[PDB]
């Protein structure tokens, strides 16, 4: 790996907002970590229907 | 009562009977389709009862007069495409930059879909007033996203939420690549 | 000389307008 | 033999809630039962019950007006961390992540920043 | 009748609003009803200090 | 979840959501849209 | 209607502004179902569309795709195809048809609209900052 790869990489990083510094991939986690992100009371609904008179 | 299939006249106008996308009624459609399979000795089951008949998406608000009548009456929202662009040898010439997004339709309470934000701009650099020391530069930077055989550069943009903001992190990213490439650093001399 | 088309806006309900003026009233149904 | 706009007149002229509810019984004159489907279909989508077509997926969403160098330029809110240690690699990182989501407004990056601020602070 | 009671001064405003609904539902919930002496309307009429135009 | 989150960044058809049993009366019944058994 | 019809009809309101309209060279409407025929009768209903709007379309059917899963009992789930490409139409024409054939989409039918806008070149990017 040439150095001049190597820097042109790192102002591709940089324009593209790619981690500049390589902070190598097992600390690399917590960006993948920031970069994502009821019957019960559907029941009552039917006994309330049942009282009024509008089920069964 | 009976069917008001036997008020309809042979030569009614349909499109009046079905506008809208509406389900099979036995007793407005004036067919006698039948569906299903036979039992022995038997005959595929009648439209009245058929819930089969009921499960089809039918086309019936959609017949050939009906589409005629309905783009016909349609016609008055369009515009002229420019007769200067003849082919898309002249479209790649005016209009060098592609911009291609996508929508989606799902059925149900949502529209929402987190795929109709991706934005892909797609520009030939020939098309790209670089120099040789420019081109090489920009091509280097890019890496994979330029494709030697056809000369194009696609950015793929889908960081920012909406598609807005993706279409203009996408300019924006071209205009650096450009300046950044038509740029020579000290370090740049010793190449 | 490329002439771009001036953009024609028109409200939010103009074509399902456009499609029930296409389609008139139907004498053997009863109201919708 | 002449018609009845013409003639004597007056000559005596030359040129809250009861509003709501004048305008409500104004509504009224016009009240009539729906005629066919379309009909329905325009008048749910004016009541707004019915999408737009041709479909946006991102309807009735705007993020609060945000533009693109809010989202992803963060680094502003980093100021008032260590600008040279350590801290400041581990926000640098943070920001990069933060930017780097689209499911997230603004306001929620930059809480998390300050979540992040104050937390570093106590400690 | 609480607001006076506390000696809260109400604003103009207000009771034009109040005498709105009054007159407008004649004293009577929202679901003709003939206009009765001495009924609310006429007590919040009287008891209001500067009377203007939209009142009357 | 942000609050959870953040200390640890320092550091059966659940597909359908319904019971085995479930999904296979559903399914035979022709219920479900699309699933077609073979 | 024999005799009792309508006099006149409200004609929506399309107004002619001043802002130029969006140009579209390519228009990839990729419509996936559960039923070939239902594919079939929808993509005849949009041709036919086209072809009186005056848009150039061209059909083809990508392949099909199948979903195996065992729960033995097995089921299965087919998803077919069908894309529909109009070519050299504008933005006001786009619209219209879209609209015409989003609300007449048959059920059980999604779609996806690949829609690539032609645009030129930012004034900033003409020639290089001095």
Sequence with gaps: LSEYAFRMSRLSARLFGEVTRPTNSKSMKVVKLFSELNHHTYAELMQTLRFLGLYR | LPPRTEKMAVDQDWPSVYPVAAPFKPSAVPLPVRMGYPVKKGVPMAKEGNLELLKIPNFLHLTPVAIKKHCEALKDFCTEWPAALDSDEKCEKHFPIEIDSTDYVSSGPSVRNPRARVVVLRVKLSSLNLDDHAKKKLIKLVGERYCKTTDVLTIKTDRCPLRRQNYDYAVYLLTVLYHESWNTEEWEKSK | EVVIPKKKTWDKVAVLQALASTVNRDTTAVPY | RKNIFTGKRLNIFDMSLWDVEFAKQLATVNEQPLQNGFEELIQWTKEGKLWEFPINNEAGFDDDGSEFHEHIFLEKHLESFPKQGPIRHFMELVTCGLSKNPYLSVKQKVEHIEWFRNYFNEK | ?56 | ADERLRINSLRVKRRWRLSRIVFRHLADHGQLSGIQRA | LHVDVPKDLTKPVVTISDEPDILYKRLSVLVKGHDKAVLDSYEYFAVLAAKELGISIKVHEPPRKIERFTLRVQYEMRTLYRCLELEHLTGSTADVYLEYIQRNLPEGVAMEVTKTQLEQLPEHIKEPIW
């Design chain 5, 1 to 56: 009748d609480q607001l006076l009671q506390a000696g809260t001064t109400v604003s103009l405003e207000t009771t034009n609003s109040l005498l709105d609904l009054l007159c407008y539902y004649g004293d009577q919930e929202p679901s003709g009803v003939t206009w009765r002496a001495k009924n609310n309307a006429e007590r919040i009429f009287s008891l209001m200090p500067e009377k203007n135009e939209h009142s009357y």
